Design a protein around this ligand. Sequence first.
Ligand SMILES: [Mg+2]
Ligand SMILES: [Mg+2]
Ligand SMILES: [Mg+2]
Ligand SMILES: [Mg+2]
Ligand SMILES: [Mg+2]
Ligand SMILES: [Mg+2]
Ligand SMILES: [Zn+2]
Lengths: 76, 70, 214, 128, 119, 202, 95
Amino acid sequence: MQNEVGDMVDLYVPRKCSATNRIITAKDHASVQINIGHVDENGLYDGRFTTFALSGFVRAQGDADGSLDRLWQKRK
Amino acid sequence: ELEKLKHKKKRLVQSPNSFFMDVKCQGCFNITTVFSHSQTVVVCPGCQTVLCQPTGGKARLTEGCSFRRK
Amino acid sequence: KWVPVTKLGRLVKEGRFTKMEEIYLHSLPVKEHQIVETLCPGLKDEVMKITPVQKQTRAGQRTRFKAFVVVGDSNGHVGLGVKCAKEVATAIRGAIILAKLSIVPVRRGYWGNKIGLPHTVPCKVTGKCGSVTVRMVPAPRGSGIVAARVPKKVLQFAGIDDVFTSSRGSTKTLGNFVKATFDCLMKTYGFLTPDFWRETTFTKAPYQEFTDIL
Amino acid sequence: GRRILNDALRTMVNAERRGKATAQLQPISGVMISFLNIMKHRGYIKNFEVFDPHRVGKITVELQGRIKDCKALTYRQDLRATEIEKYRTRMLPTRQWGYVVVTTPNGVLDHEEAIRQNVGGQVLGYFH
Amino acid sequence: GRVRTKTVKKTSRQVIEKYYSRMTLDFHTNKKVLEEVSILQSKRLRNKVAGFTTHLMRRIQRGPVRGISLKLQEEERERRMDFVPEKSALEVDEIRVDKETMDMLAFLGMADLPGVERA
Amino acid sequence: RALSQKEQDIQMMLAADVHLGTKNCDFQMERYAYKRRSDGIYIINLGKTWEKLQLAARVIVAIENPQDIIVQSARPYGQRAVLKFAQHTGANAIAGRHTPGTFTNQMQTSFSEPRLLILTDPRTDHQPIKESALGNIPTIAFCDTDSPMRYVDIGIPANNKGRNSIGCLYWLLARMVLQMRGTILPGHKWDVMVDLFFYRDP
Amino acid sequence: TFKRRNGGRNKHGRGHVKYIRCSNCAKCCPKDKAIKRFLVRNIVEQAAVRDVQEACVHDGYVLPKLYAKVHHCVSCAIHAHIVRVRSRENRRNRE
RNA sequence: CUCCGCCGGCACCUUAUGAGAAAUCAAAGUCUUUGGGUUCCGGGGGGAGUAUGGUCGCAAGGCUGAAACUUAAAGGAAUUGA
Ligand SMILES: [Mg+2]
Ligand SMILES: [Mg+2]
Ligand SMILES: [Mg+2]
Ligand SMILES: [Mg+2]
Ligand SMILES: [Mg+2]
Ligand SMILES: [Mg+2]
Ligand SMILES: [Zn+2]
């Protein structure tokens, strides 16, 4: 990461699985990036969604469903 | 809850499955306390009658012996 | 000319990417080799081993020649392609296509003082394939690349300038040996470091960002 | 037999490498609690709840999945404050992060603290 | 030893797809039909194809058939596929469920639910 | 008074034979199977089913271009269901059998880069699940109580082995996708009736 | 190269299994390695059932069946085609 | 006899997210990101479990056990063929 001068030297700070916090490599093709839209009122949609990242490990476990369930129990 | 299913020493806080029970027989309206897993026969001091029979688990009560867990 | 057949290849042909970082960040499968040719232009190709395998038939033995090529730029993108074909010409072409379809990132690090450009690998890292295994340990600046000739030819392409290598297993099999060095390099962004701890605000995927063009 | 501080460290490694949220450790110790404190203080696990009903004890730690490894170097060596520095290279992924946890006469504490206080000790384990 | 090959069979499927109402069942008509709707270079292949499309006609003219795509029969099999009753058949005035199902409803707070009856 | 959409639709699903799972359960979805009838057969928490039905609806309606979604069924009970689901939601249904390579074989004639995949049965459509696992394709699957949920992102716990269940489930997903995209104005009146989805056996 | 998980025999929890004699050749093979079939064969085949039930003295008589339990070894089983060499995959099922 | 659940056995079936040279293994896993404890034991193939020395045994034998010299392969797993 941050050089001692002010620059940041690494490339594409990777994203992390939201269920396991393992970072998803650049060849983890079993990784998904779900998008869950928000309903508001009459109309029940606008271009406003929450986003989740799931790794190949998490999906192959079979707990990828449970992770989405217990993370989409988040409230705002 | 399932913590009555989970093993005795694998529960989060170790607890016995046994209890002490107050048995009243018919032949003598007194009260006598026994342990759920008796391990020995028990005779009512008054009417001399048998109350339990020791087995591999809980005791086996004699006919018409009303017990209250306590 | 190209005639792209994957929507990623499309998004690249009308040229609304610039560098391979947006594809890597989103973990997408690159299926057309002409993507990387335009995204990373300073790419160097190189064949190191042409070894002949033989299958034996009723008539005799039919030999196929398989090519182990590495392509990369000296700035953290490296790729290994292995491809077996009857002629050495088509073996090499297939292997260079697979090499540019298997480009991965290489993150570098610093040994002790984060001054100047990064030189070594971040940490102690293991690559294993078959029975050959390779370590890469960080090395102080200006320590040269100390490793066998094969990982040295991987690493001078992958851009690492200094590193300490210790290796196990039958390194004489160049196939498994270079595939193990490449395994060790691809998983350098597999390593969860205190510096990555800051939770990552996501970005729209290419497929979701540029949807209207589809 | 038992050599706990292993029953526990390999339990957290197994649980975290799998991805569990809460792990429970069947024995406890002053070493266990003072070890988990070093992990938590350096920011590798979140809090943990020590079930001390009446027995040896029990712990449940709530992992963030931000730890990558932790190990016990049973065969607890001795360790002067000069070869702090050739273990820190020997066990750890690099010269930047990862900690070696050495029991010292100022309590259980990691190696940079040990160097600052200028004490040695005996290595209990490490984590990174 | 008279199995027609792939060229014969797939010209059969393609021609009878591409031209239905302009062929018949009587063999000898089909020959000349195909002579004017196709260009071939062997009168024995020509008869070989006609002799197979004729009983392909025989099987189609009674029932349905594999790959070939024909508009008068796709359209009708969609006309009756888009068929729904006067009123929706899954009718909910009387659902008869069992005790643990009503337990699920009790869990869900829908303790009394219209038309749900103890079996 | 009136009744909530929860209430209507749960009546729908009860009468449609969706609460009755299979003889057994899988650990990955005992978080749904509520209890056991003494037959041994389990019964699914339809409250959680309907919560996951909203979840699936949101995940579908988050797609900008509905043409970029694939829904599939290999069971001979769901072809009608999935085809009508596509004709109403603008999806791209692929009914029947799946040609291996529809997702990865970039030079196959039938190619498709779904931004989302819907699967009537994780068992029978085990080919597309694995294929998605190579192409980064999030997956919504109707998991019956004997389902291998490996590589399944959004699994609706719902019986899918009766003549009514699959049609019912796709009618619910259909209406919720339409409601969330607002194409049917608020008011539980949707003019497409359910018995359309159930297959017609010639 | 191990060819079978159970070793070709099903012995678990034991160290010794009392042996038996092959019916063909009298090779000694352990009781639970031997191809055991319980065949129950009519005294006669279906060309010879009526010609004996129209000669049974007392009407309403039913023929016996030869109940016997034959034991074979692996050699005599393969030779008699009682069992066959199955493929690597097909070798694994037990039905 | 049926249903459910705890221990404790011998096992068995699917799966890698694991290991490995692989066959295969849910324990042969938690190992180059290498340390829970403990015992025994192997260092290319032969010669050789041989010569000798010791020692137990009535005897066959057992336990302990080399060197010279010979050699560039011996061997494992799987693949195609024949
Ligand atoms: Mg035993
Ligand atoms: Mg024996
Ligand atoms: Mg048992
Ligand atoms: Mg030797
Ligand atoms: Mg051998
Ligand atoms: Mg061999
Ligand atoms: Zn025999």
